[PDB]
Scaffold this active site. Structure first.
Site, PDB file in Angstrom:
ATOM      1  N   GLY A 101      -6.338  -5.811  -2.204  1.00 37.93           N
ATOM      2  CA  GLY A 101      -6.532  -7.234  -2.109  1.00 37.93           C
ATOM      3  C   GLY A 101      -7.416  -7.720  -3.230  1.00 37.93           C
ATOM      4  O   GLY A 101      -7.209  -8.775  -3.795  1.00 37.93           O
ATOM      5  N   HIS A 140       0.815  -1.215   0.000  1.00 36.40           N
ATOM      6  CA  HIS A 140       0.000   0.000   0.000  1.00 36.40           C
ATOM      7  C   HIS A 140       0.846   1.261   0.000  1.00 36.40           C
ATOM      8  O   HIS A 140       0.411   2.304  -0.435  1.00 36.40           O
ATOM      9  CB  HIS A 140      -0.897   0.016   1.240  1.00 36.40           C
ATOM     10  CG  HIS A 140      -1.842  -1.135   1.303  1.00 36.40           C
ATOM     11  ND1 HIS A 140      -1.971  -2.069   0.288  1.00 36.40           N
ATOM     12  CD2 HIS A 140      -2.723  -1.511   2.257  1.00 36.40           C
ATOM     13  CE1 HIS A 140      -2.889  -2.953   0.630  1.00 36.40           C
ATOM     14  NE2 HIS A 140      -3.386  -2.615   1.790  1.00 36.40           N
ATOM     15  N   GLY A 171      -9.805  -3.601   1.391  1.00 35.03           N
ATOM     16  CA  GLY A 171     -10.020  -2.305   0.793  1.00 35.03           C
ATOM     17  C   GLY A 171     -10.001  -2.053  -0.686  1.00 35.03           C
ATOM     18  O   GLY A 171     -10.992  -1.622  -1.249  1.00 35.03           O
TER      19      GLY A 171
END
Ligand SMILES: *Cc1c(COP(=O)(O)O)cnc(C)c1O
Lengths: 337, 307
Positions: free
Chosen positions: A115, A63, A112
């Site tokens: 994934g 991320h 979120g």
């Protein structure tokens, strides 16, 4: 002049070094006033830090890479939780199996954004196509939704969500082994958890960041040296973590804590490659980390990564059935050339 | 362009309107992207909002007043929880009694800052002096420390900490009436809970604030109208509140929710006076609220029942 620090999640066992650094007064002894904040939604995190609204915080490697790619100037200055086992968790009887194809027509939970992208992408390699499955956004409740049957499987970490599934199984008298994971670490290190800074905040306050990491290092040493005493200090401050589930999660996390806080150059090289390949990352993208603000020497290089992964898998099992705090002993790396 | 909203506490049952405005998409229907954040330490709150680091949030009236006095430009734009009963909580057998003097030599927990000042000041009026008692900073764990015996008494809200003491008593088979409060009607709107804005953020975004309050109002009406349905929505999102204590707290809070969101001019007049008098506020201090951003008329000056 307080410094905002935003967690990546609701308080977890692995946040212990941050909270201890506060409660034990290590931040204060560095002349720092930290304001630790907790997100309600993990996806807000990179954007808030990237945009400067929050100064520092935590987020996973995958991320943090995607944050810079999407134009949020963040830099990893240290590592918290190193390479925890990530994957698609499910209960035996789901009926999902090691056959990736068994995910067909299933409801699969992701936290979120990434994934889901991760599974969209794995289907192409298994002859599946989105949508041969339904992706369901779950935020911080993947495990909960698996247990409640709202989803058939979901993405999670071995020392957190898997432990939640196991504790449920125990309440049902079912064996722990009924909690199974389809590991992505073998389809790694995306979910390493990093200390990250807003880029302009880092430019403008390098001395403060260095001092922050010293306080963190002191607390991290304490936690590794005396995990039991550390835990009770933590849950006195954070009673929400005073339960058996949290404690079990804590034991499983123990082996994953980074003891040196160093960003692992190999792990980043691997993850940057994977992400580049998935068009998340530009082809000329450069890894956004630095170890400049760590104030102590770096440890010997990673050996037998697959070896360690295998050894870690074995180790984590002993942890589950013995209930212990043991760091993975690792043989040093042999160079044959 | 996300708007940061910092709660005044760990999620509580009275935060339900905020979370519902989010989970029910009311913020989205106003074109707002809210980032709801939770403090680890309630004392960070006014400073972070005051300084502009955080855009909006929640804080009690007494704290919002002292924030401007201490040079943190914050303004209350609406009210959330109206005049909950605040006081010194204690268990019968402490042995503390309605006699304020019984606090002598006792360990008294206060949440962070103003709580201590409030008792320092009440002692002078009861012939006591700090320190005839030991003040102990407890953050969000006042009730917990009363229960664990680490303090003899502590400052708290009737619908929150008192309920926590009561639930403990029930686990011990002791009667609920053994949880007692010395109410700070000893000179109760200090602990009214307000929606507050950073001043410069408010200056630069009045339309967004107005739209935020509309989403909040919609959620607030939903909660008052259908408290039970509302609660299950809330605890689906926030499973940490799925327990009997939280639900009981919720029922006690229900009567205190402000239904119009209006700042109460009388409450502020009273609290501003109290604060001026003890040296918390300059003599020329002006109340830092406004009802300008509310978009509807001001009203006339184990159950769920509004009073
Ligand atoms: C900020 C806040 C506190 C902390 O105030 P002190 O009395 O200074 O400890 C306590 N209660 C609520 C509801 C708050 O918002």
């Amino acid at each position: 002049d307080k410094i905002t620090f935003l967690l990546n999640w609701q308080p977890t066992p692995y946040h212990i070094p941050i909270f201890l650094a506060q409660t034990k007064g290590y931040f204060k002894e560095q002349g720092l006033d930290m304001a630790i904040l907790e997100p309600t939604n993990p996806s807000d995190v990179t954007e808030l830090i990237g945009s400067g609204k929050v100064d520092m915080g935590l987020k996973a490697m995958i991320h943090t890479l995607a944050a810079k790619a999407r134009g949020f100037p963040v830099t990893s200055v240290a590592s918290l939780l190193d390479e925890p086992f990530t994957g698609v968790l499910y209960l035996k009887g789901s009926g999902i199996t090691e056959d990736f194809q068994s995910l067909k027509g299933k409801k699969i939970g992701y936290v979120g954004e990434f994934g889901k992208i991760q599974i969209d992408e794995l289907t192409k390699h298994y002859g599946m196509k989105p949508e041969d499955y339904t992706a369901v956004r779950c935020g911080m409740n993947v495990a909960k939704y698996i247990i409640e049957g709202k989803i058939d499987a979901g993405i999670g970490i071995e020392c957190m969500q898997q432990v939640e599934l196991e504790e449920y199984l125990a309440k049902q008298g079912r064996p722990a082994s009924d909690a199974k994971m389809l590991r992505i670490d073998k389809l790694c290190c995306f979910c390493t958890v990093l200390y990250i800074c807003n880029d302009e905040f880092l430019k403008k306050n390098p001395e403060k960041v260095r001092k922050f990491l010293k306080a963190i290092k002191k607390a991290t040493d304490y936690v590794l040296a005396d995990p039991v005493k550390a835990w009770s200090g933590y849950i006195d401050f954070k009673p929400q973590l005073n339960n058996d589930l949290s404690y079990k999660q804590y034991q499983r996390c123990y082996a994953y804590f980074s003891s040196s806080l160093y960003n692992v150059h190999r792990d980043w090289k691997k993850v940057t490659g994977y992400g580049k390949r998935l068009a998340i990352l530009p082809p000329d993208y450069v890894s956004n980390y630095t170890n400049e603000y760590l104030s102590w020497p770096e440890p010997e290089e990673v050996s037998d990564p697959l070896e360690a992964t295998r050894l870690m898998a074995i180790h984590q099992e002993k942890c589950r059935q013995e209930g212990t705090f043991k760091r993975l002993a690792l043989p040093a790396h042999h160079h044959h050339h």
